[PDB]
């Protein structure tokens, strides 16, 4: 059959619509630095952190468009208020507990 455990891109969703903080999680990097996008800070007891997000992620896609390697202004311009946003983050590894069932 098929076997795909190691590696699994998760789908994080952040809503708020208010230039106060953002989506609960800050990003870092940018094509301007030669790097892509990744979580830099994640607020506790927040929605993001609730979605699974955590300091040490990689925003592969946002909403629909794929950042990959865009200026910090690009990624940002992609993030922030913009209707039901879909944060695409990749994960590599599993923890003990509820995961498969």
From Swiss-Prot:
It comes from the Eukaryota. Transmembrane segments: none annotated. Residues 11-94 form the PDZ domain. Forms homooligomers. Interacts (via C-terminal PDZ domain) with MYO15A; this interaction is necessary for localization of WHRN to stereocilia tips. Interacts (via C-terminal PDZ domain) with MPP1/p55. Interacts with LRRC4C/NGL1. Interacts with MYO7A. Interacts with RPGR. Interacts with EPS8. Interacts with CASK. Interacts with CIB2. Component of USH2 complex, composed of ADGRV1, PDZD7, USH2A and WHRN. Interacts (via PDZ domains) with PDZD7; the interaction is direct. Interacts (via N-terminal PDZ domain) with USH2A (via cytoplasmic region). Interacts with ADGRV1/MASS1 (via cytoplasmic region). It is linked to Deafness, autosomal recessive, 31: A form of non-syndromic sensorineural hearing loss. Sensorineural deafness results from damage to the neural receptors of the inner ear, the nerve pathways to the brain, or the area of the brain that receives sound information. Usher syndrome 2D: USH is a genetically heterogeneous condition characterized by the association of retinitis pigmentosa and sensorineural deafness. Age at onset and differences in auditory and vestibular function distinguish Usher syndrome type 1 (USH1), Usher syndrome type 2 (USH2) and Usher syndrome type 3 (USH3). USH2 is characterized by congenital mild hearing impairment with normal vestibular responses. Involved in hearing and vision as member of the USH2 complex. Necessary for elongation and maintenance of inner and outer hair cell stereocilia in the organ of Corti in the inner ear. Involved in the maintenance of the hair bundle ankle region, which connects stereocilia in cochlear hair cells of the inner ear. In retina photoreceptors, required for the maintenance of periciliary membrane complex that seems to play a role in regulating intracellular protein transport. This is Whirlin. It comes from Homo sapiens (Human). The gene is WHRN. The chain holds residues 137 to 224 of 907 of the full protein.
